[PDB]
């Protein structure tokens, strides 16, 4: 409980970093698709929201497998994050708002912040094994 609570903030921030990078990679993949508004999330507000109320999913339901021969299958699943629209910079005839400079800057920034989260969490876990080890 205590150890779970102490390591919960950085763990949740790192998970939200992963989901934000998935969203940014989806934006980069759809960069040439006509009629695709770029999506992004407000990291701080969603992080506090996940902090106060635990993580949740839109659906994520799945077929139950009582026997050992039942065929496993799961329907679509996604986080409970609010996918907001990014304000376009300049217009385009095809009708997508994926501006590549913004996408690649957010991608690199999210990359470094995820590495920072990994460093902090690893430092804390060593900072604990140091105490326990004897």
């Amino acid at each position: 409980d205590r150890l779970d609570a102490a390591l919960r903030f950085q763990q949740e921030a790192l998970n939200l970093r992963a989901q934000r990078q998935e969203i940014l990679a989806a934006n980069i993949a759809n960069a040439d698709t006509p009629g695709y508004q770029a999506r992004d999330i407000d990291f701080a507000s969603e992080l506090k929201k996940v902090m106060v109320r635990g993580r949740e999913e839109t659906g994520g339901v799945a077929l139950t497998l009582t026997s050992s021969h039942h065929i496993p299958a799961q329907a679509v699943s996604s986080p409970a994050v609010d996918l907001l629209y990014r304000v376009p910079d300049q217009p385009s005839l095809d009708g997508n708002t994926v501006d590549m400079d913004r996408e690649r800057t957010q991608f690199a920034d999210n990359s470094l912040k995820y590495q920072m989260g990994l460093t902090v969490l690893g430092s804390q876990l060593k900072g604990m094994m140091n105490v326990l080890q004897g």
């Binding site: 508004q37 609010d82 907001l84 629209y85 990014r86 304000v87 217009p91 009708g95």
Partner: peptide, 20 residues
């Protein structure tokens, strides 16, 4: 809205007509 900011409402479909 400031470009590069975040808004909850999608941008309207843009069009470039030839004759008004």
């Amino acid at each position: 809205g400031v470009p590069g900011a975040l808004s909850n409402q999608p941008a309207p479909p843009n069009e470039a007509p030839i004759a008004t």
